[PDB]
Design an enzyme around this catalytic site. Structure first.
Site, short mmCIF file in Angstrom:
data_model
loop_
_atom_site.label_atom_id
_atom_site.label_comp_id
_atom_site.label_asym_id
_atom_site.label_seq_id
_atom_site.Cartn_x
_atom_site.Cartn_y
_atom_site.Cartn_z
CE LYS A 1 23.51 31.97 -94.94
NZ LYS A 1 22.73 31.70 -93.72
NE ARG B 1 24.28 24.78 -93.57
CZ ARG B 1 24.17 25.38 -94.76
NH1 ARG B 1 24.58 26.64 -94.92
NH2 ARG B 1 23.65 24.73 -95.77
#
Ligand SMILES: C=C1CN=c2nc(N)[nH]c(=O)c2=N1
Ligand SMILES: C=C1CN=c2nc(N)[nH]c(=O)c2=N1
Ligand SMILES: Nc1ccc(C(=O)O)cc1
Ligand SMILES: Nc1ccc(C(=O)O)cc1
Ligand SMILES: [Mg+2]
Ligand SMILES: [Mg+2]
Lengths: 275, 276
Positions: free
Chosen positions: A221, A255
């Site tokens: 991210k 995740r």
């Protein structure tokens, strides 16, 4: 101390790695890579082999500025993948979706876990998830993917996240979803600036008070990208560092795109925590 | 918080990465790789570009079962590299040595830090280190490289480490080395089994009570190897994971082979720690 679904169990006393399987053309780090069936199946087997204990199947990108996906389109992307995986592998199948139809058809196809970044707020989703009897991950988000990165603001980030989870846990329970079927994800990058993200990472252990499993997703991210100034595929180390910090604070499910690396790091975490 | 030597300031409010330069033929993960001058200088440049703020030069492998190296052999490996690095780069130079002659001659050649795994216990080493005035890292080890891994045992591991450090801090102060010039390293893999290493890692923050910078070295070691079942070069992720765990507990210097990876991880650690 184990999560369960349809005879499967998951050990929550050690960090579990959820491998990301995007079946989209436009996912931020890997759109168009695993976009078709044989490639998806290949990538899933690779993640399983690398030590993932859950596979997260997602046919809707929810990155900042993401476009809308139609019901039929998401169904066409997701359900044949769930079906093929369910028929081949003994592994948890998570479906990253917010749509009631995708929730129901995926459950029929053999899925184990509903990963809803919108916490069952879409029309029919709460009722659909309820009827599946499956565990559900609720995620915190300020705004919607189209506008969440426009001026994120909090009086107190952790206070807001706590109130959000309290409110939505109540919704789920009242709808007949047992509290012990719920997982909490504070939603890194979802309506949170760089400071917010690291504040959350630093304070993650505070969320254990709900006594529910924590799932976190930081993999590749912008919270990593903005610090290292590198493209998504070069964020493996930064992503692993975030995973280690989260896991050291007892986050149960991580995740990630890069399963092998994360699994190796979780071994070191596990050996550290058990000493 | 703030360390200085030779007019250079090492900020220790944020984790610092020490890059390993082995100038040996037999080091456990890389012996023979950077074993000559040009390639030593080459490898040091690459570590500098990757964000290393210390370069650690070592002419004596001390892996379990390592062979002795002559005084004349060590000087030949180390001092021409120190010289070339000091005359070329604006960075802290660390010498990983135990020999007095190597301490003295490396300081003469322009070194900044004495990294001694034997904590200045070799004959004349304490006096030689004193006469340089340079910062010294003191490392804990049970036994000697030849036998250290033959049944490591501790009644309490952390207690022993503390007692070891207390004693050698005193030895240094008495000999004229001021406390504020000292760094402490609990010596991962040095006379410690798998359980000991991870016990140490889990309890690392306890050593902050001395109020001295902590240096740690876990990079590519068997404490990673035994868990991951991959060869030394494939241990980058495991090594970085150890570095993150250590730095989250406030360890200030991380001694590593893989600088770029470690620096990136330290950036994430720093962002997390400074977010209250
Ligand atoms: C980009 C995504 C897509 N789906 C996610 N799902 C969960 N639960 N958490 C995330 O952080 C997440 N990030
Ligand atoms: C293998 C080695 C060689 N030198 C070292 N030096 C320090 N200070 N710490 C270590 O862990 C270390 N390991
Ligand atoms: N769905 C998301 C995908 C990516 C990011 C991010 O890069 O911060 C956030 C949300
Ligand atoms: N000098 C050393 C080199 C390697 C190891 C280790 O692998 O544990 C320990 C000490
Ligand atoms: Mg996705
Ligand atoms: Mg060495």
């Amino acid at each position: 101390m184990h999560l369960t679904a349809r005879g499967l169990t998951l050990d929550l006393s050690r960090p579990q790695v959820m491998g990301i399987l995007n079946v989209t053309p436009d996912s931020f780090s890997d759109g168009g890579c695993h976009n078709n069936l044989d490639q998806a199946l290949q990538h899933a087997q690779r993640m399983l082999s690398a030590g993932a204990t859950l596979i997260d199947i997602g046919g809707e990108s929810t990155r900042p500025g993401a476009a809308e996906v139609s019901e039929q389109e998401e169904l066409d992307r997701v359900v044949p993948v769930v079906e093929a995986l369910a028929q081949r592998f003994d592994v948890w199948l998570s479906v990253d979706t917010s749509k009631a139809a995708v929730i129901t058809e995926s459950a029929h196809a053999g899925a184990h876990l509903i990963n809803d970044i919108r916490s069952l707020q879409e029309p029919g989703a709460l009722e659909a998830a309820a009827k599946t009897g499956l565990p559900v991950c609720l995620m915190h988000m300020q705004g919607q993917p189209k506008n969440m990165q426009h001026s994120p603001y909090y009086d107190d980030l952790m206070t807001d996240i706590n109130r959000f989870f309290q409110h939505h846990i109540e919704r789920c329970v009242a709808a007949g979803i047992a509290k012990n079927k719920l997982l909490l994800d504070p939603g890194f990058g979802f309506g949170k600036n760089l400071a917010h993200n690291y504040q959350l990472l630093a304070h993650l252990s505070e969320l254990h008070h709900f006594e529910l499993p924590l799932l976190v997703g930081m993999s590749r991210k912008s919270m990593v990208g903005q610090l290292l100034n590198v493209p998504p595929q070069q964020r493996v180390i930064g992503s692993v560092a975030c995973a280690v910090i989260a896991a050291m604070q007892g986050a149960q499910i991580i995740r990630v795109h890069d399963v092998k690396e994360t699994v190796e790091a979780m071994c070191i975490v596990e050996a550290t925590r058990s000493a």
